[PDB]
Amino acid sequence: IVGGYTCGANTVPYQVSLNSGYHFCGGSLINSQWVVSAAHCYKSGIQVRLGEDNINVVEGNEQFISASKSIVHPSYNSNTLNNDIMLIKLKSAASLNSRVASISLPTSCASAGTQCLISGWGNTKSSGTSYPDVLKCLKAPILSDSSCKSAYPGQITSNMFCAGYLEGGKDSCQGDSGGPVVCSGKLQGIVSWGSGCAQKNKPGVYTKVCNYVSWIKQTIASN
Template identity: 60%
Template sequence: MAPFTKKKLKKVFLLLHLISGLEDDEKIVGGYECPRNSVPYQVSLFTGYNYCGGVLLSDQWVLSAAHCKPRFRLGEHDIWEPDHTEQHIMSAAFIRHPDYNPRTQDSDIMLIKLSQPAILNNYVRPAVLPSDCGSAGTMCQISGWGNIRPSDEGSRYPDKLQCLEVPLLSDDTCFNAYPFQITENMICAGYLEGGKDSCQGDSGGPMVCEGQLQGVVSWGHGCAQRNKPGVYTKLGPTTPSRSVTPIVYAE
């Protein structure tokens, strides 16, 4: 059976969100509303609702998960209200990693070229690719507009960008959580006790550790479940999945 990617069942969850109404101040599965414009490299892949996340790498290139389908909003915070910092840009080209496997989610990474350069400013700014691999225990920030409830509590989608700090987990811990499913292109982050995680709608979004982009949201078994941390496509300097990124800097 294929892994449960973070965008599956999104349309069903959107319907539940629309009928749920306003509730108490819950956050992205244990997270919080990001300070406005504090994640300037965050991209919303938007098709009438936030479908996936992405990461700005340069004024013309966005990185996301290979299983996502993109249209772009940059400089976004509240996806339903004008922030006057947004840039809406169409896509011009897609480059999925040649080794992407939709069954296993290996090499779940994609580059998208924008149809026109983004205007870089305080609200729209590229992320920094890592010069080394993050170590277990390093705290990282993830962000997105995905589901803010654990899998066993239904769904609710926020209007405003949500953030969460999660620790990188060791390769052994990651493998033990998902036996024979973790490849060299994957890294786990999160809490084994559950309660805090990325979720549906966060796919392709950034995991930034000590100022460097160490991964993008990829998959997991449910959201915020005990002993099932989030799985991210690894972007360390020697990781095979990163092999598509040099094209960004060759232009």
């Protein structure tokens, strides 16, 4: 996250870190046994780490559970990043409490102008690299789909939306991939892509989770 603030330990209880020997992507817990993340974060051998704040120090609220199945969206296209979303089932259910909790799926798509909370342990600089150990947060509006499409001509599909600031300065970034965009207490987006980070006229682009709710519910019902 570039230009955000330190969230505070366990203030984002649905935030997950995906670990394969190191943190490589975020995710969101959507019930005690399932995590949603970005399909471009797919790897075999994922361990899901819940209840995290400092990812390099064991602080006492963590649950580390390995994945039993990963399901990338059937129409994920890695060239266009259309349908960048995947479901991860945990080997055993997480114990849910105030510090480890799930986030609700949306019943409606959020509109442009709604302020949302994006969080993750990704890069905090638009030039150079510095990865934080504690979770960073950013409040950002969803942008109109015409300003999103003017920023990225020919690249925005109906399963994507832009959120951020067209003047740059504040944005999600590499390592934030797969993490949550929450608006009005519902999961509305998944950190997906963008050109650089926090650059002028290049806002972050996010998977539009309200288009996938029937696919998620159906897949969790049968797996």
